[PDB]
Design a protein around this ligand. Sequence first.
Ligand code: HEM
Ligand SMILES: N=C(N)c1ccsc1
Length: 289
Amino acid sequence: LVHVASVEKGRSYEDFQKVYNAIALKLREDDEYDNYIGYGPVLVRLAWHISGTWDKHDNTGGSYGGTYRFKKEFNDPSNAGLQNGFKFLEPIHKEFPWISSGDLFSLGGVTAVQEMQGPKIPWRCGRVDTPEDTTPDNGRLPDADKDAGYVRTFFQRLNMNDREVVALMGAHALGKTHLKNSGYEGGGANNVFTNEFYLNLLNEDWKLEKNDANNEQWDSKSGYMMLPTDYSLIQDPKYLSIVKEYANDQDKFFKDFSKAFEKLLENGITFPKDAPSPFIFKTLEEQGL
Ligand code: HEM
Ligand SMILES: N=C(N)c1ccsc1
């Protein structure tokens, strides 16, 4: 199964920077969302979930087709809460109707990471909307009540290795869980992209508790929380080494996250030899906007 990237007709870097800027300005404007976290974290989660359906074995799923717009995927229990991100992006799509859905959802994640002071994430255009019958079935996204062995095996399907997995999970520095969405009780939350997920894992006094949905999660007296799959990164000796590496080197985490996040967003896509180079967008701050 082959998905060839096809640049939206006549568009170039400046077109996509305009879309980036619209997303970033709206991120700034709609600041009250989710107890003043804003929409940055849910947009990152949206980009991960539309990409995280990919299966390396037959190239089904993945960001290319923009299939989250269809009811089957939109209504995946695993995607509960992402409707807020979709609604956020709706007026952006209305202003720029030429951008494909996959391009918009993935660009939403890149914009959010950068505007939350994360690393630059190079981004490529050319995802093409595919028909409703190409929508992957529910159940391809990961469970949170599992251990390190599960996390490792799960991510092999996305062609991600240990370092990639531990880097991607650092996105859990952002936002929070919501009991009504996932059955996990949210803890302290931030909207600034840092390596503090790793510092929290290593430095907090974690207690295994049961929440009001009767699920186990790890909580600290400081008010932070970790999913069982988060905590599994310091239970497994290979993951633990990498957690310590990123806890002690912010730049290395940023660089590794940027590579893994772009790879995640591009899995499944064949780029022509003469496709444009990846774009690196300027932030609003860098533009003086
Ligand atoms: C084993 C892998 C993963 C599991 C089991 C997992 C599970 C979860 C769960 C249960 C939530 C709470 C959703 C809610 O209640 O609203 C969440 C939130 C989040 N996840 Fe993950 N996740 C995983 C990997 C990732 C990856 C790879 C990324 C991106 C690189 C990511 C980004 C996020 C973000 C940014 C949020 C916060 C969303 C918000 O504040 O609304 N996650 N995750
Ligand atoms: N471990 C956390 N505080 C987390 C998990 C999903 S989003 C934030």
